[PDB]
């Protein structure tokens, strides 16, 4: 009708279709808000390795989809997931994204150890995991890109292959309206007290929570299931103690400060500290690991350490050193991803 016919049919003939280039039926590994993700392999077998194939939820190009494609297309770093290809399906108006396949993640890895303890064996796996996470976020932050939702589910680790045991950060908050938030286990206290903007500091707090969880095998600020949340703050004070005026001077400039004063009392958390908590989970406060963790889990955002400064911490110069393969050449005990047949 509107468009040139020769141009139209030439592109239709040349256009690569996902169904023709990749085998993925009954290989669905995940379904969520993001859409449907599959463990895919090439039909014309050149590479002969696994790929993560993601059909985005909904039709067309949303703002969330548009920014995800925009940023991933520029970002390149070993510790950040790489967008390999983008297939646009013209008839149904669906958008497909192709990634490198990651067999594991911190959510499953930590759950396996917590499961194993009832029913971290390379000594520097936690340190290696931590260093690669920091390296990846440093890359994003250096390019003024925030993650905005760091948690063990989003920290992927590569299975057997060339990139064996490399951390890959996934699922950045690509589109939040006006850069604003306007489980809670990894969310920094300023967000819980109604901060209007995401910051680099917010991502760092989440890394501290993941590092604590890696050391103990339990979420440090574990809790029951808009900005304000009393029981989550109750848990943070149960671990950390209540922040003194000297510790966080700007706390009075938070919108939910009066609600905090109404609902809480310093005296309640008198015998509470990160030292005492980590002592209960067999981690020494003399250790370099603890002193780094304390710098990451600081109540006041402006007193929180940067990812650059975290990578320069003498913890990473202490034996054992961080390795590129977090498994350190060991056999991987964690199972492969199960397929989701039910649609």
């Amino acid at each position: 009708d509107k468009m040139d016919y020769d141009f139209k049919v030439k592109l239709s003939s040349e256009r690569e279709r996902v169904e023709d280039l990749f085998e993925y039926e009954g290989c669905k590994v995940g379904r969520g808000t993001y859409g449907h993700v599959y463990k895919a392999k090439r039909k014309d077998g050149k590479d002969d390795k696994d790929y993560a194939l993601k059909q985005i939820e909904g039709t067309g190009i949303s703002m969330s989809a548009c920014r995800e494609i925009a940023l991933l297309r520029e970002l390149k770093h070993p510790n950040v997931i790489s967008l390999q290809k983008v297939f646009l399906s013209h008839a149904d108006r669906k958008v497909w994204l192709l990634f490198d396949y990651a067999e594991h993640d911190l959510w499953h890895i930590i759950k396996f150890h917590r499961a194993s303890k009832a029913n971290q064996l390379p000594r520097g796996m936690v340190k290696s995991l931590l260093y690669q996470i920091l390296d990846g976020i440093h890359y994003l932050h250096a390019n003024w890109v925030l993650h905005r939702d760091l948690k063990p589910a989003n920290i992927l680790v590569m299975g057997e292959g060339p990139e064996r045991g490399r951390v890959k950060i996934a699922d950045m908050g690509f589109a939040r309206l006006f850069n604003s938030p306007l489980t809670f286990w990894y969310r920094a206290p300023e967000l819980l007290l109604g901060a209007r903007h995401y910051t680099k500091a917010i991502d760092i707090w989440a890394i501290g929570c993941i590092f604590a969880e890696l050391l103990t095998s339990e979420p440090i600020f574990h809790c029951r299931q808009n900005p304000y949340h009393h029981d989550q703050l109750d848990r943070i004070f149960n671990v950390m103690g209540f922040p003194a005026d000297k510790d966080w001077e700007d706390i009075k400039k938070m919108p939910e400060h009066s609600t905090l004063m109404k609902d809480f009392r310093r005296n309640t958390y008198t015998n509470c500290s990160l030292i005492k908590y980590m002592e209960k989970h067999k981690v020494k406060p003399d250790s370099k690991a603890f002193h780094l963790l304390q710098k990451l889990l600081t109540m006041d955002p402006i007193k929180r350490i940067t990812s650059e400064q975290a990578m320069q911490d003498p913890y990473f110069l202490e034996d054992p050193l961080p390795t590129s393969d977090v498994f350190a050449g060991c056999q991987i005990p964690y199972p492969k991803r199960e397929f989701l047949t039910e649609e």
């Binding site: 703002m63 548009c66 297309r73 970002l75 006006f178």
Partner: protein
């Protein structure tokens, strides 16, 4: 701002800084129907259309520049007959506005804007009203994203320019004039041929010459290929001579009829 210091390993630098001869070679298929002068007059016209669309929608200048670059990039590769540039101009603005996190452009607001702008400001070029509904934009959007190979992040001369005039210490005297010369450079191919910061220096030089500001030592203290900057200044100076000789409003109706049109299906 996202990816601000990443230009030298960006998809802009690595894929969308073209060669002048490759560009002119692909242009010869449209030069069968139009002259060299008429193709450039057509480029000026659709640059003004995208500016008028952006102003009406109250979009920031960075969003208008990105959409202008999307438009140039498309027709650098393909003919004017492939997709109607009346359809592509608002599609470029629509996609460009979605790349930025601040603000939203609705479907109805885009269609209303495009109709109003061509009616009010471009009636010399278009007697009939804007014929495209929103389904035409959404279908077109998919073609635009494909040809650009999903290269959505565009670097522009404004951010470099601000940094240079701040470094000179004469923002009040120079920035207004240099900034408008940067706007003018989008009438030309320069954004597909040279890095942003090179265009910024050229515009600032011309601004200095226009205002009789002696800045020879400052320009000498920079470590850049100065021969390339003089190539950009000549294009900018040639642009203003073309501006002088070109009555857009009197000539553009005839030029748009000389465009090759999209053939229907058999």
């Amino acid at each position: 701002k996202a990816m601000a210091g990443n230009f030298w390993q960006s998809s802009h630098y690595l894929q969308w800084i073209l060669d002048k001869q490759d560009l002119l070679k692909e242009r010869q298929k449209d030069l069968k129907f139009l002259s060299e002068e008429e193709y450039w007059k057509l480029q000026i016209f659709f640059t003004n259309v995208i500016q008028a669309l952006g102003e009406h929608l109250k979009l920031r200048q960075q969003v208008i520049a990105t959409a202008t670059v999307y438009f140039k990039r498309f027709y650098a590769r393909y003919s004017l007959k492939s997709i109607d540039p009346v359809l592509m101009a608002p599609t470029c603005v629509f996609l460009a506005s979605k790349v930025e996190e601040f603000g939203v452009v609705s479907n109805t607001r885009l269609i209303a804007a495009a109709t109003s702008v061509l009616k009010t400001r471009f009636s010399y070029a278009f007697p009939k009203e804007f014929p495209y509904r929103m389904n035409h934009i959404l279908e077109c959007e998919f073609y635009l994203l494909e040809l650009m190979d999903c290269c959505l992040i565009v670097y522009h001369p404004y951010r470099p320019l601000l940094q240079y005039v701040q470094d000179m210490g004469q923002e009040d005297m120079l920035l207004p004039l240099a900034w408008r010369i940067v706007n003018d450079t989008y009438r030309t191919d320069l954004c597909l041929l040279y890095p942003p910061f090179m265009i910024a220096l050229a515009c600032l030089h011309v601004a200095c010459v226009v205002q009789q500001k002696d800045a020879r030592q400052w320009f000498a203290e920079l470590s850049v290929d100065m021969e390339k900057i003089l190539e950009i200044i000549r294009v900018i100076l040639k642009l203003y001579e073309q501006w002088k000789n070109f009555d857009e409003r009197k000539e553009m109706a005839t030029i748009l009829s000389k465009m090759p049109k999209p053939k229907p299906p058999p």
